[PDB]
Design a protein around this ligand. Structure first.
Ligand SMILES: CCCC[C@@H](CN[C@@H](CCCC)C(=O)N[C@@H](CCC(N)=O)C(=O)N[C@@H](CCCNC(N)=[NH2+])C(N)=O)NC(=O)[C@@H](NC(=O)[C@@H](NC(C)=O)[C@@H](C)O)[C@@H](C)CC
Lengths: 99, 99
């Protein structure tokens, strides 16, 4: 679809079999989801944002559906202010910025 | 133009008579630019995301050019690790997400 930016680019996602809401974020390298129970092996990771760094659990090769589109990649689970879908997965669903 | 997401969507902008490189961030409500001595009245403000909040100076009616596209709106100036173009300006250059 074509999504304008007058409102936050929020979309429904399916992860771990659970429906969640996430922000399509072109300014995020990675995908960061709020703390949740996710089937998979993970390893400690640290990421940065506008005000500093936070610790997250890095889960590799996670199957996830974003607005009806499938992607299989790295998902970071931690205390993020908001669920964000980063470029790592947006590239998988063929998302581009256009103006 | 079309901007893929294989790498950070960085564009050249012009603000305060200076040229800078900024990240098109669909996950940012506002525009945060690195510390610069902009002329005029401003309002104290705090903005946050991953890592926490940072103190910024809110400047209104700032004329800015993004990737050759004119825009005018609110610009927050402060200790940001990266120049961020948020939705408030991206909407003005008619930028959309497509997949
Ligand atoms: C979590 C909040 C929603 C998404 C977020 C993403 N912002 C980008 C901007 C900074 C880019 C460096 C970001 O943090 N991206 C991270 C996301 C985490 C991630 N791992 O992908 C990133 O790419 N981090 C890279 C590092 C960037 C490298 N660049 C550099 N160091 N200069 C990483 N860790 O690999 N938005 C924001 O940070 C904006 N906040 C918001 O839009 C809202 N604030 C809140 C708290 O929700 C609004 C109510 O103000 C900021 C800029 C204020 C307007």
């Amino acid at each position: 679809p074509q999504i304008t930016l007058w409102k936050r680019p929020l979309v429904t996602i399916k992860i771990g079999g659970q429906l969640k809401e996430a922000l399509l974020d072109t300014g995020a390298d990675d995908t960061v989801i709020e703390e949740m129970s996710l089937p998979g092996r993970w390893k400690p990771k640290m990421i940065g944002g506008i005000g500093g760094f936070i610790k997250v659990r890095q889960y590799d090769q996670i199957i996830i559906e974003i607005a009806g589109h499938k992607a299989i990649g790295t998902v970071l689970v931690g205390p993020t202010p908001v669920n964000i879908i980063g470029r790592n997965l947006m590239t998988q669903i063929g998302a581009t910025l256009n103006f």
